[PDB]
Design a protein around this nucleic acid. Sequence first.
DNA 1: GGGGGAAGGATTC
DNA 2: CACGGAATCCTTCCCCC
Length: 341
Amino acid sequence: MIVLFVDFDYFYAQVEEVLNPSLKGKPVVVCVFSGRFEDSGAVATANYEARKFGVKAGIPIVEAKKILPNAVYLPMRKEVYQQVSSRIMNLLREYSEKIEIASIDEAYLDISDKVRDYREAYNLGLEIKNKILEKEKITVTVGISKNKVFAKIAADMAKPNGIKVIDDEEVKRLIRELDIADVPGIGNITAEKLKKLGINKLVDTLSIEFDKLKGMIGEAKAKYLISLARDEYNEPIRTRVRKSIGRIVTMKRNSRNLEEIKPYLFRAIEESYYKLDKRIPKAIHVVAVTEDLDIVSRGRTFPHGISKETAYSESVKLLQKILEEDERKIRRIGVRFSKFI
DNA sequence: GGGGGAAGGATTC
DNA sequence: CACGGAATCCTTCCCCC
Ligand SMILES: Nc1nc2c(ncn2[C@H]2C[C@H](O)[C@@H](COP(=O)(O)OP(=O)(O)OP(=O)(O)O)O2)c(=O)[nH]1
Ligand SMILES: [Ca+2]
Ligand SMILES: [Ca+2]
Ligand SMILES: [Ca+2]
């Protein structure tokens, strides 16, 4: 099977440039301001001219200002990036019908019935890249291989604005050279666990007894690594469906006062419903980020849909259940709706 | 012994 | 000093055949 993976370069920042080309060349950082003070918040992402100095997704906006005081700092405009993404995805949907939109800027295309041998795939790659650069003026990186995982790894090795192919032979070389940490799905928590098992390469997962790999990282992940090691990973590409909609917000100050948190929670609910489109959820979860960046949630499933009146009422009850079972102060509050009809 | 929810936590991207 | 949207997986409790 031949899988082509696409991943837009420094997406949010690159969109901000396209919309104001006068930004190209200068350091661009897209921020999410929490409003706890002037520049409280984090970096959603930044362009290469900024990333080369350490400014990247996840760090505090303040840290970023210490490093690049003169960089251009723009507030994150999610709705806009979302549309630019949709237009591109619609464009990809014309090079293949079997498409899986993994994230706001990732997509896997199954082009097995559109080509043969990696030569035409590469060409189909430059075709897509050129097309996207023409109609939306966005640069993307392409990855091509036998399955979704290897297609993604390929892209990573080819960024930025690149394209690469990992053939059935190149793959065999990766199973022994690739750090188990650079495999998708293996974050820091899992990378260290596999380290204590003497698993530094994908192939090394074949040495341990399955029963103790499972004991360390769970069955799912275990069978996952083993499959990629035996070159037996072959997950189908397919339309993924939104199964959850929600909204979280940060409060000016950490609180425990129910009447103090409510207005925030109610704002989360109001946006969540507008976002719901016209979907009827039967489950609702209240999510709170406590004072020490720890997450705690409480929810309920109903035998019928949830009107907005019911969401309001139940959310307050669920928040109360949280303050009563956790002594910590609340920093962030939000709601999540699921189990749509 | 075991299926399927539901709930709350844990990780990853 | 650190935001957010959402998917998947895990352990536990449960009701009960
Ligand atoms: N709000 C928020 N957005 C994030 C975060 N991490 C990534 N994103 C955004 C950044 C991009 O706009 C989009 C895709 O992220 P990627 O990991 O693919 O990196 P990016 O697109 O920045 O460029 P790259 O792949 O490194 O060339 O998702 C995050 O921590 N918070
Ligand atoms: Ca990207
Ligand atoms: Ca991406
Ligand atoms: Ca990693």
